[PDB]
Amino acid sequence: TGGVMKPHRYRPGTVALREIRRYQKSTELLIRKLPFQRLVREIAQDFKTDLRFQSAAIGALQEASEAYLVGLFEDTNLCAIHAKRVTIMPKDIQLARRIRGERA
Amino acid sequence: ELAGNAARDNKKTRIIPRHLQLAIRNDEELNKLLGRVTIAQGGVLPNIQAVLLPK
Amino acid sequence: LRDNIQGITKPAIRRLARRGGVKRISGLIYEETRGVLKVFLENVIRDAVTYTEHAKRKTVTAMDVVYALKRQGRTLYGFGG
Amino acid sequence: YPADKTEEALTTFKTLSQNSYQNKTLGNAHNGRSTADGMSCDCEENWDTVSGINNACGEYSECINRLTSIECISGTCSCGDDCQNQRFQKKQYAPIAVFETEKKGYGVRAQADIRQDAFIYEYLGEVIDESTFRKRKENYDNQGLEHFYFMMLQKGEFIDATAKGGLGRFCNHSCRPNAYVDKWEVGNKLRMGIFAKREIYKGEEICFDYNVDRYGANPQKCYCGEDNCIGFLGGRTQTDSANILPVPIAEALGSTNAQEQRWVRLMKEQNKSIKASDYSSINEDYVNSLEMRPIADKDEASKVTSALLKTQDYIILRKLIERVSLTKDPEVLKEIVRLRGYQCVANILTMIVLDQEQQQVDVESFTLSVLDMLESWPNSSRNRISSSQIESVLESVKTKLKKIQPIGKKINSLLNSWSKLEISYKIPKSQ
Amino acid sequence: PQGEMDLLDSTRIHPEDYSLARKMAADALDIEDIDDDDESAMRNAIYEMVFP
Ligand SMILES: Nc1ncnc2c1ncn2[C@@H]1O[C@H](CSCC[C@H](N)C(=O)O)[C@@H](O)[C@H]1O
Ligand SMILES: [Zn+2]
Ligand SMILES: [Zn+2]
Ligand SMILES: [Zn+2]
Numbered sequence: 077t078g079g080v081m082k083p084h085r086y087r088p089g090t091v092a093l094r095e096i097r098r099y100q101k102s103t104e105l106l107i108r109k110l111p112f113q114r115l116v117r118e119i120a121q122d123f124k125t126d127l128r129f130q131s132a133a134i135g136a137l138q139e140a141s142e143a144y145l146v147g148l149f150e151d152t153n154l155c156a157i158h159a160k161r162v163t164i165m166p167k168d169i170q171l172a173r174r175i176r177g178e179r180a
Numbered sequence: 181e182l183a184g185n186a187a188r189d190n191k192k193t194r195i196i197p198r199h200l201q202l203a204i205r206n207d208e209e210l211n212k213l214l215g216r217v218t219i220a221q222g223g224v225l226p227n228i229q230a231v232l233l234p235k
Numbered sequence: 236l237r238d239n240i241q242g243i244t245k246p247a248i249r250r251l252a253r254r255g256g257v258k259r260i261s262g263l264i265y266e267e268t269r270g271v272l273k274v275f276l277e278n279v280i281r282d283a284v285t286y287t288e289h290a291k292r293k294t295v296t297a298m299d300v301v302y303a304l305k306r307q308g309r310t311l312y313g314f315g316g
Numbered sequence: 317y318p319a320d321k322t323e324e325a326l327t328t329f330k331t332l333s334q335n336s337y338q339n340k341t342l343g344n345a346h347n348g349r350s351t352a353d354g355m356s357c358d359c360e361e362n363w364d365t366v367s368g369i370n371n372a373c374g375e376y377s378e379c380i381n382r383l384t385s386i387e388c389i390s391g392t393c394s395c396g397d398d399c400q401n402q403r404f405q406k407k408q409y410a411p412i413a414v415f416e417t418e419k420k421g422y423g424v425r426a427q428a429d430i431r432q433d434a435f436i437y438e439y440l441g442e443v444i445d446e447s448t449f450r451k452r453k454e455n456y457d458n459q460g461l462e463h464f465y466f467m468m469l470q471k472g473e474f475i476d477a478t479a480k481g482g483l484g485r486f487c488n489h490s491c492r493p494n495a496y497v498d499k500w501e502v503g504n505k506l507r508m509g510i511f512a513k514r515e516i517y518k519g520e521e522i523c524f525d526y527n528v529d530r531y532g533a534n535p536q537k538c539y540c541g542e543d544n545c546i547g548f549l550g551g552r553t554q555t556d557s558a559n560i561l562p563v564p565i566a567e568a569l570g571s572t573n574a575q576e577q578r579w580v581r582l583m584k585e586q587n588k589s590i591k592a593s594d595y596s597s598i599n600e601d602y603v604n605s606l607e608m609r610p611i612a613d614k615d616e617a618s619k620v621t622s623a624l625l626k627t628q629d630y631i632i633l634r635k636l637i638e639r640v641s642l643t644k645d646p647e648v649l650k651e652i653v654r655l656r657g658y659q660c661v662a663n664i665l666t667m668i669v670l671d672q673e674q675q676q677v678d679v680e681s682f683t684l685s686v687l688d689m690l691e692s693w694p695n696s697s698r699n700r701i702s703s704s705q706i707e708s709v710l711e712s713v714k715t716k717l718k719k720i721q722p723i724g725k726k727i728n729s730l731l732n733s734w735s736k737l738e739i740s741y742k743i744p745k746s747q
Numbered sequence: 748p749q750g751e752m753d754l755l756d757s758t759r760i761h762p763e764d765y766s767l768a769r770k771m772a773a774d775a776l777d778i779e780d781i782d783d784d785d786e787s788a789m790r791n792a793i794y795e796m797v798f799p
Contacts, residue, residue: 077536078453080474081467082527082551083499083508086385089234092258094384096228097355099254103198103223106250111242118236119273119280120295127284128294136220136300136314137279142251143218144275144309145268149255156257157229163259164252166267173271197313220313224254232258233383654780654788696782703779740783743774 105138112138148172182207197221240269279303317519318415325414325422330480332440333407335507342473343443345504354392354503357381361396373401375433387502403435404502404509410436412522414486419539421463422486423521430516436495439467439508440482441475449474462536464528464549467497469506484510490523491538491545497524527551532573535563547622552593557581560602561632562595567616568623569635570609579605598629606635611643614651621652624660630674630682633664637686649693658704661686665706669713680720683713687726691733699740707731748794749787772796 099106113134120127148169155168173179182203187195201222204210248268252260282303287295301316310316337343345351357379362371372395373379373388381388382401390397398406411427430436444452449466456465456478465478465485477485487495487510494516500507510524523540528551535548553559557580558573559566566576579602584590591597611617620636627633643649665686669679701707714727755765769789773781776796781788 077462077464077533078457079464079466079528079530079533079549080449081464081497082529083468083470083497084527086499089258090383090385092253093228093233093380096253096256096258097226097380097384099250100224100226100256101353101355103221106254107243107247111239111244114236114239115242116276116280118239119276120284121236123281123284124288126293127287130294130296132297132314133283133295133300136297136304136311137276139220140218140279140300140304140309140311141272141276145248145251145272146224146255148271149252149257153229153255153257157231162232163261164257164264165261166264169264169267169271216308217310217312220311228256228380232256233378233380650785654785656780696784699779699782742779743771745775745777 105142107138107142109134109138112141151176182210198223201225240273243269243272279307282306318417320413321416321422322414325483325486329478329485332480332482335440335443335475336480337443338445338448342445343469343505345501345506350504354389355381355384355386356393357388357395357401359393359395359399361394361399363396370396370398371400372396373399375400385498385500387500389503404438404500404507407438408435409438409483410434412437412483414483417488417521420488423523424483424487425521426516426518429518430512432512432515434512436510436512436522437482437484439475439477439484439497439510440480441465441467441477441485442480443469444474444476446472446474449476452476452478464526467508468529469508470499475508488521488523488540489526489528489538489549490521490540490542491525492542493523493525494520495522495524529553532558556584559593559595560590560599562626564619565595565623565627565632568620569603569606569632570611570639571606575606598627598632600629600631603629603631603635608635608639608642610645611639611648612645614648617648617651618655621655621657621660624657624664628667630668633668634682634685637664637682637689640689641685643689644692646694653693653700656703658690658701658706661690662704662706662709665709665713670709670716676717676720680717680723683717683720683723684726687723687730691726691730695734695737697740698734698737699742701734701737702739707734748790754793754797769793 113129116134116137117129120129149164151172152164152168155172156162156164159168170179183195183199186202186206187193187199190199192199197219198221201219202225204214204219205225245265248265249260252264252268279300283295283299286299286302287293290299297314301311301314304311305316335343341348357373359372359377359379363369364371371377373382377400379388379395379401381393387404388395388399388401390399390402393399395401410430413425413427414422415425417423424437453466461478465476465481467475467477469475494512494514495510496513497508497510500509510522516522526549528549530550530553532554535550538545538547538549548563557577560576560579561569561571566572580590590599611620620640623632623636665683668674669683672679674682695701710727710731714724717723753765755762755768760768766783766786766789769786769792770783773789773792776792778788778792781792
C-alpha cells in the first residue's frame with residue numbers, strides 16, 4: 077500500500093486567469109525573433125530581393141505587430157462579451173475589422 | 181511628473197517605458213491626446229472584465 | 236524561405252490573445268490571426284519598401300518603418316522618430 | 317453515535333502545526349523562481365469598527381488572488397493585514413472529530429455544519445523528494461502497513477503523512493466524495509488544502525477522492541459503501557503495457573501484470589498498433605492469444621463472477637468459459653454456485669444466442685463450448701437452478717436454434733438430468 | 748465464525764441439534780444461497796443472527 081494520491085488538475089480558467097495577470101504585468105516580446113524575422117523577409121521578398129533588414133527595423137515591426145494584435149484581441153473580446161460568450165470566434169475578428177474600417 | 185509618481189508606487193527609482201505607458205494611459209486627457217500612439221516596451225494596463233470572472 | 240507563416244506558433248498567438256484579456260480561444264481562430272497579421276505586415280512592409288526604393292538604398296532602416304507606420308496613423312515612439 | 321477517538325488518533329503520530337521541509341529548495345512556488353513582483357490584490361481594506369475584523373478579500377468579495385488560488389500576504393498587499401484570504405496562514409481549520417468506523421478504522425466527522433466551498437483542513441506532512449519517497453515506501457511495505465499516507469504535492473515532490481502530519485490523514489476514500497483536495501499558492505510556497513464540494517451537516521463523515529496512483533502496487537478493495545463504487549482503490553496505472561483489461565476481468569482470464577506486459581512488449585515495440593489504456597473497447601486478439609489455466613482459488617472464482625456480471629464482450633466470455641472447462645476443482649464450482657454462476661451464464665447465453673451480434677456457426681460453437689461444464693458441474697438440488705431459472709433460457713435457445721439438433725439434444729440431456737434433482741426445503745415464514 | 752469455539756456451546760441445545768439450530772438461523776435470515784451441506788455458511792448465518 078505505497079500508492080500516491082494525485083493532486084488532480086486545475087479548473088479551466090484558473091491557470092488562464094493566472095497567465096492573464098502574468099502576461100498583463102510583464103512586458104517582454106511574445107513573438108519569437110527569428111521566425112518573425114523570416115516571415116518579414118518572406119513578405120519583403122515578393123517586391124524586390126537583395127533587401128537587407130536592420131535589427132532596429134525588425135524590432136519596430138515586431139512591436140507594431142504586437143500592439144496591433146493586442147488591440148484587435150481586446151476589441152474581439154469585447155465582441156465576444158457582447159454576444160453572451162466567453163470564447164472568441166473568427167466571426168468576431170471579422171466584425172471587429174469591419175467596424176474598425178480595416179476590412180471593407 | 182505622472183511617470184515619476186507611477187514609478188514611486190512601483191517602489192522603483194528607474195523610469196522605464198512601462199511607467200511612461202502607465203502614466204499616459206491612466207490619465208484621461210493624456211490618453212485622449214496620445215490616442216493613436218504605441219509605446220515601445222510599454223505593455224498593457226491590467227484590465228479584467230467583470231462578467232469574465234467566475235461566480 | 237518557404238511558407239514560414241507557421242512560425243507564428245500556437246502558444247505565441249495564445250499569449251498575444253491572453254494579453255488582451257481573452258479567457259478562451261477557439262480552434263479555428265489561429266489561421267484568421269495569421270491572415271490578419273500577414274495583411275498588416277504586407278501593408279507596412281510595402282510602404283517601407285517603396286520608402287527605401289525612393290531613397291536609392293538597398294537596406295530598409297528603422298526610420299522608413301517608423302515613417303510608414305506613422306503615415307498609417309500608427310505612430311511609434313522610441314525608435315528615433 | 318460512535319464514541320470519539322480524537323485524542324487516541326492524535327497519540328498515534330507527531331502532530332504538526334505546519335508542513336515540514338526536507339530542505340529549503342523543495343516546495344517553492346514556480347519551481348523556485350522567486351516572483352519578486354508578488355501578485356498584490358487591489359482590494360481596499362474593509363475594517364468593521366465594531367468587531368475590529370478586516371473583512372477585505374472575503375468569500376463573496378471580488379478578490380482576484382482568491383479566485384486564482386493565491387493567498388494575500390500581510391505587508392505586501394493593498395488588502396492590509398488580517399484579511400479574509402489568509403486561511404492557510406491563520407490555520408482557521410473547520411471543527412472536526414475522529415470516530416472509529418466499522419471497517420475503515422479512524423475517520424473524520426464534521427463537528428459543525430460546513431458551507432459549500434469552505435476550507436475544511438490543510439493536509440499536513442513532510443515535504444520529501446522522490447528518492448526519500450521510494451525509501452520510505454519500501455520501508456513501509458516491509459513493515460506491512462495497509463494504509464496510504466502519500467500525496468503528490470507536484471512533480472517530483474511528495475508529502476508523507478505517516479509519522480508526522482495532521483488530522484487530514486484520517487479522511488477515508490469515497491467514490492462519491494463530499495470534499496476534494498486542491499492546490500493553492502501561499503507566498504513563495506505551495507500548499508494542499510481540502511474544500512467542501514457541497515453542504516455538509518454535523519456528524520457526517522468528511523471524505524475525498526484519493527485518485528491514487530498504485531505505481532504497480534496491487535489493488536485494494538473499496539468498502540466505502542457508495543452505490544457508485546468501482547470496488548477497488550485505484551487510478552491510471554503506469555504509462556504503457558500496465559493493463560489491457562480491468563484487473564478483476566484480467567485476473568479472471570488468468571492474465572496478470574506479466575501477461576499484460578508481454579503482449580504489448582511483443583507487438584507495440586515492433587511496429588504494431590495497440591491503443592491507449594481504455595476498457596470501453598475490448599481487443600479480441602489479446603483475449604484469443606491469452607493462455608488459460610484451471611482455477612483452484614475461490615477469490616479467482618469471485619473475480620470470474622464479477623467479470624461475467626461486467627464484461628459484455630463475446631470473446632472474453634468465450635475464453636472465460638473455456639478456462640472454466642479446463643477448471644475441474646469441485647470447491648471452486650461450489651463457490652460459483654454460491655455466487656450463482658448459473659445466473660450470469662443465463663445472461664451470457666442470452667446476449668449471444670438470443671441477441672445476434674455474431675454468426676450462427678460461431679454461436680453454435682460457443683453454445684457447444686458452454687453446455688459442457690453445465691453438464692459437468694456437481695448439482696444436488698433444484699434450489700441452485702431456482703436462483704437463476706436458466707432452464708427457461710435453455711428452452712428459449714433450443715427453440716430458437718431448433719435446426720441445430722446437437723444443441724437441442726444436449727439441452728434435452730441437461731434438463732433431464734436437472735429435473736431428477738429435488739428442491740431444498742425452505743421453512744415457511746409467517747405472513 | 749469458523750473458529751474452534753461455538754456459539755451453541757453456551758446454550759442448552761444438544762450437539763446433535765447444532766445443524767438443526769443453524770438451519771433455523773439461516774432460514775430465519777431469508778438466505779437463499781444456503782445449502783444444507785455447507786456448514787460454513789450455516790455458521791456464518793447463525794453468527795450474524797446472534798452477533799450482528
Ligand atoms: N473506503 C475505504 N474502504 C476501505 N479502506 C479504506 C477506505 N478509505 C480508506 N481506507 C483505508 O485507509 C487508508 C487511508 S489512511 C485513513 C486512516 C486509517 N484507516 C486509520 O484509521 O488509521 C487506505 O490506504 C485504506 O487502507
Ligand atoms: Zn484581495
Ligand atoms: Zn487579502
Ligand atoms: Zn468505493
